[PDB]
């Protein structure tokens, strides 16, 4: 269900082109004639409002925005009951006869597991996890448990529900912790970091994506280079510049990945320009980054403007370490900013204690604040040193 | 966690990247 | 034209550049950049760019 | 289909050209693995100067 999830994701916010939502809408109507996508489109209008929420024919009666092409016509309306008879009335009667004839054990479990995948395309989630629970008691080895954790993971992928799905994803590994091969051991930890990207835990969850996407891909939902853009942007985002030379710019998979398609423009254009300390050509590569990468990708657009605040402070911080004092004519008259427009970027970063820099408003001499031998031994020691008696007397003064 | 959530506005990408286009044309 | 030669070109470019810096860095620092470019033999913008990279 | 189903020494030339595919792709893992298997299997045969020299 990645095709309808990735392409129709442009229905959230697209400020670039109008045909982006139109071209992606063709894949929605093409894939829905085979398998039922109806519960996916119903949630699109129930998530974001006053943008695309008025395009549904029957939810409430509304017409708005630019898109008349996403809807259920009189054909799919009559096909709504046709798919329900095949996915419920037809399948449940065949499995019910298996319990009466008592044929096999794991074969009956795989029947409920395969049937449980149809409930994801139905839109009733109470019977989705119920059928998986019936096959849970019939599951013996780890072969039948592979598709169980995949169907449960689709509940948060297909319905975009990060609340009730993460409880079931953790319940499988917590009740019985085995993992089998290290391939699945990374799968239980991958789904853990997916729901943490919705709450935006930053480098905690995002550090596992660059490791998993550079080794193995499920290959069933998508391809290797389609979701590779998630690890390309978060690669330089989470990892410091010191380790970018031994990891990102030199990699067996990444250097062969840029030759597959030009839609990345991260591990190549942004990495080489950042390692060369040249910000003249580095910034125009960011112009095609957010547009052609962050917006179309799902988990990347969940952040969007959350990337730059961490990245914009870091790109200048690395330049301040290479010189004691810089010049305003280098920043204002050359690369990324003008004179007056510089106050908007570094103006809000310093009061947040993100970086320490000094700009001269007369002679135009940029000055860098260097802690020298102070560092965390003196100043930062006082800050985090007060937490010793703060956390001790918090619950300690009340005894029991 | 939640402090980073609200403090980020609609500014930056959609805005500052539109300024970088006209900035290089004036130089 | 050769990639293996061009790959070692930047390697030998920095190799002889670091060797020229060892003559500058060995005595005391705080010398004018204008006199540094005369010892290196490149432009002021090129010397400041390559020195800050190391 | 080329492993011991047709010509055994022919893999020496196949794995040799396989390293050149990942060479321009800047992939060290697949280039070292294909060249090591080619040189290890090159001990059982002798090619007239057009392989071992490469």
- If residue C47 lies in a helix (H) or strand (E), which one and from where to where? helix C44-53
Nearest to B27 by CA among A364, A349, A204, A339: A339
Q: Which experimental approach was used here?
A: cryo-EM
Instruction: Report the Cα–Cα distance between both ends of chain D, in Å, rounded.
Output: 25
Sign of the torsion formed by the C-alpha atoms of C19, C23, C24 and C29: positive
Nearest-neighbour CA in chain D from A262: distance (Å): 14
Report the alpha-carbon distance of residue A364 to residue A361 in Å, rounded: 6
Distances A314 to A240, A273, A305, C53 between C-alpha atoms, Å: 9, 14, 15, 16
Q: Looking at the domain assignment, is residue A150 inside a domain?
A: yes
Phi, psi at A326, each rounded to 5° = -100, 180
**A376 domain residue, yes or no:** no
Chains that touch D (3 or more CB pairs under 8 A): A
DSSP, collapsed to helix, strand or coil, labels residue A8 as helix
Residues of B in contact with A308 (CB under 8 A): 12-13, 16
Helix axes A106-122, A38-47, angle to 10 degrees: 50
Same domain, A167 and A307: yes
Q: DSSP letter at A162?
A: -
Q: Is there a single domain that holds both residue A261 and residue A205?
A: yes
Residues 6+ apart with CB under 8 A from A360: A328, A366, A367
Same domain as A329, residue A279: no
Describe the strand order of the beta sheet including A357-358 as a list of residue ranges: A325-327, A365-368, A357-358
Q: Are residues A347 and A242 in the same domain?
A: no
Distance between CA atoms of residues A365 and A387, nearest Å: 38
Note whether A6 and A162 are within 8 A (CB).
no
d(CA A204, CA A233): 15
User: Residues of A near D (CB-CB distance < 8 A)?
Assistant: 250, 252-253, 255-256, 259
Cβ pair B13:A306 closer than 8 A: no
Regarding whether A267 and A188 lie in a shared domain, the answer is yes
- Subunits with at least 3 CB pairs below 8 A relative to chain C? A
Distance CA A167, CA A126 (A): 15
Q: Quote the distance between the C-alpha of residue B12 and its chain's center.
A: 1
Give the end of a domain, one of A298, A322, A346: A322
A-contacting residues of B 1-27, CB under 8 Å? 1, 4-5, 8-14, 16-17, 19-21, 23-24
Q: What is the DSSP letter of A385?
A: H
Residue C9 to residues A287, A297, C44: CA-CA distances in angstroms? 32, 39, 21
Look up residue D54 and give its DSSP letter.
-
Judged by 3 or more CB pairs under 8 A, whether A touches D is yes
Instruction: Kindly give, in sequence order, each residue whose CB lies less than 8 Å from that of residue A229, ignoring residues fewer than 6 positions away.
Output: A263, A264, A266, A293, A297, A300
Contact A104, A95 (CB under 8 A): no
Tell me, yes or no, whether A157 and A261 share the same domain.
Answer: yes
- What is the span of the domain harbouring residue A4? 1-322
Distance from CA of B12 to the nearest CA of A (A): 6
Residue A392 counted as domain residue:
no
| CA atoms of A393 and A396, how far apart (whole Å) | 5
Report the Cα A290 to chain-centroid distance in Å.
Answer: 14
CA torsion sign for A176, A180, A184, A186 is positive
By residue count, chain A amounts to 400
Same domain, A243 and A265: yes
How close C50 gets to chain A, by Cα (Å)? Answer: 9
In a domain, A378, yes or no: no
For A36-59, the DSSP string reads --HHHHHHHHHHS-SSSTT--SSS
The last residue of one of the domains, among A266, A288, A322, is A322
Is residue A396 assigned to a domain?
no
A185 occurs within a structural domain: yes
A204 and A312 belong to one structural domain: yes
Between A and C, how many CB-CB pairs are < 8 A?
8
- Residues present in chain C in total: 54
Q: Which helix (H) or strand (E) holds A325?
A: strand A325-327
A47 located within any domain = yes
**Domain contains A397:** no
| CA distances in angstroms from B8 to A310, A393, B14, listed in the order given | 11, 34, 13
Same domain, A303 and A365: no
Task: Count the neighbouring beta carbons within 10 Å of the beta carbon of residue A351.
Answer: 7
Q: Residue A115: which H helix or E strand, with range?
A: helix A106-122
Cβ pair A364, A329 in contact under 8 A: yes
Same domain, A111 and A219: yes
On whether both A288 and A339 belong to a single domain, the answer is no
What residues of chain B lie within 8 A of the CB of A306, using their CB?
4, 8
Helices (H), A182-243: 182-198, 203-212, 228-238
**Total structural domains in chain A?**
2
DSSP for A16-32, please give it. Answer: S-SHHHHHHHHHHHHHT
In the DSSP assignment, the letter for residue A86 is: I
Quick one: A238 and A282 in the same domain? yes
- CA distances A141 to A109, A111, A180, A335, Å, are 11, 16, 10, 60
What is the H or E stretch that residue A365 is in?
Answer: strand A365-368
CB neighbour list of residue A145: distance below 8 Å, 6 or more residues apart: A139, A172
Is the Cβ–Cβ distance between A144 and A106 less than 8 Å? yes
Tell me how many degrees the CA angle A53-A58-A64 measures, rounded to the nearest 5: 35
Residues in chain D with CB shorter than 8 Å from the CB of A259 are 25
- The DSSP symbol for A350 reads G
Backbone angles phi, psi at A358, to 5 degrees: -130, 130
Distance CA A50, CA A236 (A): 35
Rounded-to-integer distance, Cα C35 and Cα A250, Å: 36
């Amino acid at each position: 269900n990645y095709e309808v999830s990735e392409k129709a994701f442009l229905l959230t916010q697209s400020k670039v082109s109008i045909e982006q939502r139109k071209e992606a809408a063709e894949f929605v109507l093409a894939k829905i004639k085979e398998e039922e996508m109806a519960p996916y489109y119903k949630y699109l209008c129930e998530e974001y409002l006053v943008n695309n929420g008025q395009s549904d024919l029957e939810h409430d009666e509304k017409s708005d925005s630019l898109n008349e092409w996403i809807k259920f016509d009189q054909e799919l309306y009559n096909e709504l009951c046709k798919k329900n008879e095949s996915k419920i009335k037809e399948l449940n009667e065949k499995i019910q006869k298996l319990e009466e004839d008592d044929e096999g054990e794991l074969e009956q479990a795989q029947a409920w597991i395969n049937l449980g995948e149809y409930y994801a395309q139905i839109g009733d989630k109470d019977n989705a996890e119920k059928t998986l629970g019936k096959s849970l008691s019939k599951a013996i080895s780890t072969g039948a448990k592979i598709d169980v954790m995949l169907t449960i993971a689709r509940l948060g992928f297909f319905y975009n529900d990060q609340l009730y799905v993460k409880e079931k994803l953790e319940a499988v590994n917590s009740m019985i912790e085995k993992g089998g091969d290290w391939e699945r051991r990374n799968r239980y930890k991958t789904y853990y970091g997916i729901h943490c990207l919705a709450v935006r835990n930053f480098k905690e969850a995002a550090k596992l994506l660059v490791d998993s996407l550079a080794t193995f891909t499920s290959i069933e939902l998508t391809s290797y280079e389609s979701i590779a853009t998630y690890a390309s942007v978060t690669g330089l985002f989470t990892l410091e510049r010191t380790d970018l030379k031994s990891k990102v710019i030199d990699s067996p998979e990444l250097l062969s990945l840029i030759s597959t398609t030009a839609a990345l423009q991260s591990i190549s254009s942004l990495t080489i320009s950042l390692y060369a300390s040249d910000y003249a050509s580095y910034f125009p590569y960011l112009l095609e980054t957010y547009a052609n990468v962050l917006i179309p990708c799902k988990y990347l657009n969940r952040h969007a403007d959350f990337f730059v605040r961490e990245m914009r402070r870091k790109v200048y911080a690395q330049l301040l370490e290479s010189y004691k004092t810089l010049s305003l004519k280098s920043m204002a008259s050359a690369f990324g900013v003008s004179v007056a427009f510089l106050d908007n970027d570094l103006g809000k970063f310093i009061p947040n204690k993100q970086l320490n820099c000094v700009i001269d408003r007369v002679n135009g001499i940029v000055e860098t604040n260097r802690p020298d031998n102070k560092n965390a031994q003196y100043h930062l020691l006082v800050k985090q040193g007060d937490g010793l008696l703060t956390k001790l007397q918090k619950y300690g003064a009340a005894v029991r | 966690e939640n402090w980073d959530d609200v403090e980020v506005d609609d500014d930056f990408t959609n805005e500052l990247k539109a300024e970088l286009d006209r900035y290089k044309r004036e130089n | 034209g050769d990639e293996l030669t061009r790959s070692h070109f930047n390697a030998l470019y920095d190799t002889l550049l670091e060797s020229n810096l060892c003559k500058i860095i060995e005595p005391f620092e705080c010398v004018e950049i204008s006199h540094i470019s005369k010892i290196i033999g490149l432009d002021t913008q090129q010397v400041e760019g390559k020195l800050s990279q190391m | 289909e080329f492993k011991k189903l047709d010509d055994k020494p022919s893999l020496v030339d196949v794995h040799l050209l396989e390293s050149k595919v990942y060479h321009k792709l800047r992939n060290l893992a697949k280039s070292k693995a294909s060249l090591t298997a080619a040189r290890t299997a090159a001990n059982s045969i002798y090619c007239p100067t057009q392989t071992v020299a490469e």
